[PDB]
Design a protein around this ligand. Structure first.
Ligand code: ZN
Length: 266
């Protein structure tokens, strides 16, 4: 039985829905651990050696721990599951890529397709099962998320802003046709970015700013105070929640976070 290692919980869960126990799906950065800054342990090194296929986000998500993906089993490839996704930079222009491509309905389909493709090349005798599984999961995501997009698209053009702490929604904004404002591009910053967000929120009359499940809510609340806006609450973006939490799957993560976003716009 083949072993497929996903770099973090979001990719692991997507892969599980496509493979459905045809392969063993493992995860490097488990839910609750930090996808942007991870220390690979000795036990993790065993997962890496056992991997017949390694599934990474790319867009530099794994840059600080890519060095551990060495001395690999012969034939084991590292697949970048964001292939075909136009990067969005961390600056406001050339700059490093923002890694959070999975916060997008469109990109969900691309993650799924790339994983289907890689699983099929790894395990070609199960091609028909991966094909079926990938379509079913794609439809499942679409059925849950599209009604949220439909509500979101009713927002008036003046209020088309996602304001967050980390720049975690830049791909969602591009996907749905919103503008995004944030305090720092990637979780572990700067006074000027905070000042810029405060001025932009006042200039555009923005009413809400969120924080997220793995960072502090204090900067968002301070910005809310200084802008006469409201704190929007906590979104899930960088990790699945614990199993008894609100976002224990990728589908649930998208559904929860987008629901919470719509429920502040209306
Ligand atoms: Zn992040």
């Amino acid at each position: 039985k083949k072993v497929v290692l996903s770099s973090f919980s979001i990719i692991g869960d997507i892969t599980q829905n496509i493979a459905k126990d045809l392969v063993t799906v493992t995860t490097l950065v488990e839910a609750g651990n930090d996808s942007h800054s991870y220390q690979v342990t000795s036990a993790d090194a065993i997962k890496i050696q056992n991997a017949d296929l390694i599934l990474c986000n790319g867009l530099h998500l794994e840059e600080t721990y890519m060095k551990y993906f060495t001395n690999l089993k012969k034939g084991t490839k590292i697949i970048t599951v964001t292939d075909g996704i136009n990067p969005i930079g961390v600056s406001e222009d050339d700059s490093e890529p923002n890694p959070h491509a999975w916060m997008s309905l469109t990109n969900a389909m691309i993650y799924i397709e790339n994983i289907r493709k890689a699983l099929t090349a790894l395990d070609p005798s199960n091609a028909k099962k991966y094909e079926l599984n990938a379509r079913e999961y794609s439809e499942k995501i679409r059925n849950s998320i599209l009604p949220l997009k439909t509500r979101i698209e009713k927002v008036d053009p003046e209020k088309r802003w996602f304001v967050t702490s980390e720049g975690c929604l830049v791909y969602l904004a591009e996907d749905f046709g919103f503008k995004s404002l944030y305090l720092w591009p990637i979780n572990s910053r700067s006074p000027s970015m905070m000042r810029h967000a405060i001025n932009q929120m006042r200039s555009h009359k923005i009413k809400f700013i969120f924080s997220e499940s793995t960072n502090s809510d204090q900067p968002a609340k301070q910005v809310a105070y200084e802008t006469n806006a409201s704190y929007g609450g906590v979104l899930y973006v960088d990790s699945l929640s614990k199993p008894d939490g609100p976002a224990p799957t990728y589908l649930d993560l998208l559904r929860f976070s987008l629901t919470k976003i719509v429920d502040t716009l209306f």
